[PDB]
Design a protein around this nucleic acid. Structure first.
Ligand SMILES: [Mg+2]
Ligand SMILES: [Mg+2]
Ligand SMILES: [Mg+2]
Ligand SMILES: [Mg+2]
Ligand SMILES: [Mg+2]
Ligand SMILES: [Mg+2]
Ligand SMILES: [Mg+2]
Ligand SMILES: [Mg+2]
Ligand SMILES: [Mg+2]
Ligand SMILES: [Mg+2]
Ligand SMILES: [Mg+2]
Ligand SMILES: [Mg+2]
Ligand SMILES: [Mg+2]
Ligand SMILES: [Mg+2]
Ligand SMILES: [Mg+2]
Ligand SMILES: [Mg+2]
Ligand SMILES: [Mg+2]
Ligand SMILES: [Mg+2]
Ligand SMILES: [Mg+2]
Ligand SMILES: [Mg+2]
Ligand SMILES: [Mg+2]
Ligand SMILES: [Mg+2]
Ligand SMILES: [Mg+2]
Ligand SMILES: [Mg+2]
Ligand SMILES: [Mg+2]
Ligand SMILES: [Mg+2]
Ligand SMILES: [Mg+2]
Ligand SMILES: [Mg+2]
Ligand SMILES: [Mg+2]
Ligand SMILES: [Mg+2]
Ligand SMILES: [Mg+2]
Ligand SMILES: [Mg+2]
Ligand SMILES: [Mg+2]
Ligand SMILES: [Mg+2]
Ligand SMILES: [Mg+2]
Ligand SMILES: [Mg+2]
Ligand SMILES: [Mg+2]
Ligand SMILES: [Mg+2]
Ligand SMILES: [Mg+2]
Ligand SMILES: [Mg+2]
Ligand SMILES: [Mg+2]
Ligand SMILES: [Mg+2]
Ligand SMILES: [Mg+2]
Ligand SMILES: [Mg+2]
Ligand SMILES: [Mg+2]
Ligand SMILES: [Mg+2]
Ligand SMILES: [Mg+2]
Ligand SMILES: [Mg+2]
Ligand SMILES: [Mg+2]
Ligand SMILES: [Mg+2]
Ligand SMILES: [Mg+2]
Ligand SMILES: [Mg+2]
Ligand SMILES: [Mg+2]
Ligand SMILES: [Mg+2]
Ligand SMILES: [Mg+2]
Ligand SMILES: [Mg+2]
Ligand SMILES: [Mg+2]
Ligand SMILES: [Mg+2]
Ligand SMILES: [Mg+2]
Ligand SMILES: [Mg+2]
Ligand SMILES: [Mg+2]
Ligand SMILES: [Mg+2]
Ligand SMILES: [Mg+2]
Ligand SMILES: [Mg+2]
Ligand SMILES: [Mg+2]
Ligand SMILES: [Mg+2]
Ligand SMILES: [Mg+2]
Ligand SMILES: [Mg+2]
Ligand SMILES: [Zn+2]
Lengths: 56, 118, 119, 142
RNA sequence: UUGUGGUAGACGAGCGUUGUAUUGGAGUUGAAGUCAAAGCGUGAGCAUUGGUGGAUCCAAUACAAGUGAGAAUGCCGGCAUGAGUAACGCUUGGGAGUGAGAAUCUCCCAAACCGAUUGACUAAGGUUUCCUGGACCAGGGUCGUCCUUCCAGGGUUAGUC
RNA sequence: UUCUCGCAGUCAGACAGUGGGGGAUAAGCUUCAUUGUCAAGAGGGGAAGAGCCCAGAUCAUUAAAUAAGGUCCCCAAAAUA
RNA sequence: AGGGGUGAAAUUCCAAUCGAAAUCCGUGAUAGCUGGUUCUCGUCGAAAUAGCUUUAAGGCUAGCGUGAGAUCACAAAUAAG
RNA sequence: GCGAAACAGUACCGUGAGGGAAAGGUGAAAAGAACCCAGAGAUGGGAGUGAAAUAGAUUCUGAAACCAUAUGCCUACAACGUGUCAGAGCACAUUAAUGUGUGAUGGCGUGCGUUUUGAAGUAUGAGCCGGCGAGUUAUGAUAGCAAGCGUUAGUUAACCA
RNA sequence: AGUUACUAAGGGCUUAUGGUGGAUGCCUUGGCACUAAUAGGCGAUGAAGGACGUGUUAACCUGCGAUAAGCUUC
């Protein structure tokens, strides 16, 4: 099955109206200050007060 | 002598495009759809000039008919009285009087009501 | 559609768990996908609690899970588990391992996870 | 006062880049960098480089404060495409169009920067009308 | 005064493009082109101003035409729609390292398939695809620091095959 | 609308009324004669309709009188007996 | 080796093509058959009928259109007898 | 315009005979951007040369379709060939014109060519944009219009200068 | 109880700008058709057309032929 009529440039944007992106929640590390996405280990391997991995 | 087309097609095409300004999407972008819409719009404009002449008469008749029913007289008899009294006034100006000059419109109805025809 | 790939069979899943648990017992940290770490954690905890008595029956039970690694063999991993790792968790009521989430991979955007032995 | 940075023939498609560019328009400098550094998209480590270069040449070349910069407009214009032949079934063939995007990021220090652009457009229109009036005066003079 | 709907069709009057011949005129103080604007005509059409542009062009009277594009499942080039959709064409986990960036590159340990074969020697064909170092324009259906891709250098030794 | 000369296009028609043939006094059937419309003709009535009725659009006017048709509301316009 | 070959025979095969390969040439073959044919305004404006036709989707002549000229009444139309 | 303005009978297609493309323009002069900043680098932003760098090697001019950004207006009870005639409110000010941009709402409204008795067509042709694309030439005949020469008229063809 | 605005996920119109694209305009070491002359052939003393090789010079093109990007004479 294929479109018997061409879809205009307006129906295309109406369908894409729901294709927008969402900003992931971010927080501040408590030992170095750089922003990291929430509930994940920072770049220093320091999650909370626990040294997870060696520094980058 | 190889005559080459340029600025001839584009000018006459852009005229049609300019006329079809304010249309929905491709109806103002592409020359072909723009040309069809302008021709159709010209037909509509022609037909609605005639239809405007008739529709505004109908609206004046409606307003005049209403203005008379408040006083107990009907449109069908008001025009007859107007003719017998020789008074010649457009329904447009008569409706304009009944909306703008209630006292003078009431004066015309009073004379046509009872005064001797001619 | 035919000639499809074998797939994530049950045997493949058991072997995957075996390899990760052997490595996490050998080194002490594993950087894997989150959904694979959340499945290896169960087997890791089960192995550690069963290796708390150190009888020959428990060695036979563990040997059905351990695999050869670079830092230890299948026989020296046994000595490391029963003499170094497991005796440390002698009165801990479960939860010897922790899984924490790292960032998404550059080529997959899948959520990584580090599985470690919780001291 | 707009500072800007450009990148021609970026491998990312404009469709998949506008989705990321709309996440930073109107945002402050530090917050825009923070948002773009933790988004799992391919067109995030390329807009980040362009944004950083734009900040550098705004606070070094054009002499801007640096604590008032906001992303004025970040867009991904359509770039030149590349045509390849994908071999189909039963002897047929199709055309693969590798799409490229021309990325441009622009930041300003004044939060009323649109007004000046409208002002320049108005000035151009006024000069046209002024020329017409002077020509009319000359026509009547003769 | 009588008229002026109109297809096939007949007749008459004009517009526009390119060039040539005679006259005159404009142009780096900005020509053609090209875009925009709230102009002029009964119609083909014609001006004014401003931006861009950088060297030719305009008016009149005649003459000669490859002289007028909306349609030919018309030809060529570009760009949409379908749609970020179908598809990405039989093979896993981890440790260490390089690197600006690693599921994809190097090493190691396993793991899974082939094992009258995915093993080894050659004929035919292919014609440098072979080895080393470097690179990541393009190609690799993803990625790539890597490649049978690209660059530079090198490589094939017969009295008995 | 006769005569002479130049240039054509047309040779698939349709429906309505009237008089008939074929059909079954069936066909939005088929074949004729005649009056009209459409073809090549918009407008008003028929709710919507190529052919039925009123008529023939040079352009503009938010002027007036009318044809067929109609006057509770949609939708302009009526009352008496 | 092609108005030829081969065929334990099916119109099989003869470079993904075979009621007779592929390519170039005569060649811009022919087509009463489809499709297309490009600026404007003004005046006028049809026919889908008759005869002939190896003719019926075509053609010729007549009929109907248009341009020019002639015929003024004895020509042609509209009413009455 | 020769298929071929460039290294064209090339690239490429086919076993072969054979078939057969596209692609030109920086600036007067490379004076082709030293140097600084971000970046791994290409590159970009400054600086510099230049009359011009929005002439930067992507190199004369740069149209439309197409893709994005924004001032102003409208749009989430609404039956839509998307326009037309009326019409509030909103926002501006012009080729000064009973001005321009949008259009809450009311009346009316089934595209363009083709071929048909008859097409909104459940017949047909076009996805959109731009370029190209179809009544000619040579030799004769007839007719209309006009000019030259004329009542023993009129006019030359080949050829020669 | 009654009449009421702000919403714009998105879209529409006008105008302005940016990007892909190479239409239009100007030009050309290139083609086409001819005019006036010249000439109408080369080859066993090795032809036309090719292969290979030749640099102080990467490849390609052109020139040349072991006398090889040139040798002698006027
Ligand atoms: Mg849009
Ligand atoms: Mg969607
Ligand atoms: Mg054209
Ligand atoms: Mg099994
Ligand atoms: Mg194949
Ligand atoms: Mg496509
Ligand atoms: Mg007429
Ligand atoms: Mg001229
Ligand atoms: Mg100009
Ligand atoms: Mg032509
Ligand atoms: Mg397509
Ligand atoms: Mg798409
Ligand atoms: Mg779908
Ligand atoms: Mg799906
Ligand atoms: Mg899928
Ligand atoms: Mg595969
Ligand atoms: Mg796999
Ligand atoms: Mg096996
Ligand atoms: Mg083998
Ligand atoms: Mg090779
Ligand atoms: Mg190698
Ligand atoms: Mg290498
Ligand atoms: Mg790739
Ligand atoms: Mg030997
Ligand atoms: Mg008949
Ligand atoms: Mg008949
Ligand atoms: Mg009948
Ligand atoms: Mg009968
Ligand atoms: Mg009958
Ligand atoms: Mg019938
Ligand atoms: Mg017809
Ligand atoms: Mg009618
Ligand atoms: Mg009706
Ligand atoms: Mg008339
Ligand atoms: Mg009346
Ligand atoms: Mg009546
Ligand atoms: Mg009423
Ligand atoms: Mg024969
Ligand atoms: Mg048979
Ligand atoms: Mg075969
Ligand atoms: Mg032909
Ligand atoms: Mg024939
Ligand atoms: Mg007439
Ligand atoms: Mg008739
Ligand atoms: Mg008849
Ligand atoms: Mg026939
Ligand atoms: Mg005839
Ligand atoms: Mg070949
Ligand atoms: Mg620059
Ligand atoms: Mg370009
Ligand atoms: Mg340019
Ligand atoms: Mg609403
Ligand atoms: Mg409701
Ligand atoms: Mg309805
Ligand atoms: Mg409506
Ligand atoms: Mg409306
Ligand atoms: Mg409608
Ligand atoms: Mg036409
Ligand atoms: Mg038909
Ligand atoms: Mg039919
Ligand atoms: Mg329909
Ligand atoms: Mg059909
Ligand atoms: Mg047909
Ligand atoms: Mg179609
Ligand atoms: Mg076209
Ligand atoms: Mg003559
Ligand atoms: Mg939005
Ligand atoms: Mg919008
Ligand atoms: Zn940290």
């Amino acid at each position: 099955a294929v479109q018997q009529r061409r879809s205009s440039k307006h129906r295309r944007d109406k369908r894409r109206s729901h294709d927008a992106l969402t900003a992931q929640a971010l927080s501040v590390c408590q030992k170095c200050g750089k922003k990291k996405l929430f509930h994940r280990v920072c770049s220093c391997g320091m999650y909370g007060d626990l040294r997870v991995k060696k520094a980058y | 002598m190889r005559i080459k087309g340029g600025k001839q097609t584009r000018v006459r095409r852009k005229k049609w495009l300019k006329q079809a300004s304010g249309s929905f999407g491709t109806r103002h972008a592409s020359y072909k759809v723009a040309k069809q819409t302008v021709i159709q719009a010209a037909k509509y404009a022609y037909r609605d000039r005639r239809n405007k002449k008739r529709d505004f008469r109908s609206l004046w008749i409606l307003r005049l008919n209403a203005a008379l029913r408040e006083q107990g007289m009907t449109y069908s008899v008001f025009i007859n009285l107007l003719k017998k009294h020789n008074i010649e006034i457009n329904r447009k100006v008569l409706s304009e009087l009944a909306i703008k000059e209630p006292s003078k419109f009431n004066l015309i109805v009073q004379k046509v009501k009872s005064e001797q025809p001619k | 559609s035919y000639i499809n790939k074998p797939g994530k069979t049950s045997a493949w899943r058991v072997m995957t768990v075996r390899q990760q648990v052997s490595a996490v017992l050998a080194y002490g940290k594993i950087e894997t996908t989150l959904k694979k770490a959340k499945n290896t954690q169960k087997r890791l905890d089960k192995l550690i609690t069963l290796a708390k008595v150190d009888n020959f029956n428990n060695r036979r039970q563990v040997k059905k899970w351990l695999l050869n690694t670079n830092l230890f063999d299948v026989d020296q991993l046994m000595d490391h588990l029963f003499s170094k790792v497991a005796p440390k968790y002698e009165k801990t009521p479960g939860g010897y391992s922790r899984v924490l989430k790292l960032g998404p991979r550059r080529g997959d955007a899948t959520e990584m996870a580090i599985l470690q032995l919780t001291d | 006062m707009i500072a800007f940075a450009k990148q021609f023939r970026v491998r990312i498609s404009p469709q998949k880049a506008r989705l990321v560019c709309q996440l930073i328009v109107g945002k402050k400098t530090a917050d825009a960098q923070n948002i773009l550094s933790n988004t799992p998209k391919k067109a995030a480590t390329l807009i980040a480089k362009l944004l950083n270069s734009a900040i550098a040449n705004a606070t070094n070349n054009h002499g801007m404060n640096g604590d008032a910069l906001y992303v004025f407009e970040c867009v991904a214009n359509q770039g030149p495409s590349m045509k390849r032949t994908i071999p189909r079934a039963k002897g047929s063939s199709n055309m693969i169009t590798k799409r490229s995007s021309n990325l441009v990021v622009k930041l300003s220090d004044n939060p009323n920067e649109r007004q000046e652009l409208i002002k320049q457009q108005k000035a151009l229109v006024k000069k046209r009308v002024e020329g017409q009036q002077k020509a009319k005066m000359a026509r009547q003079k003769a």
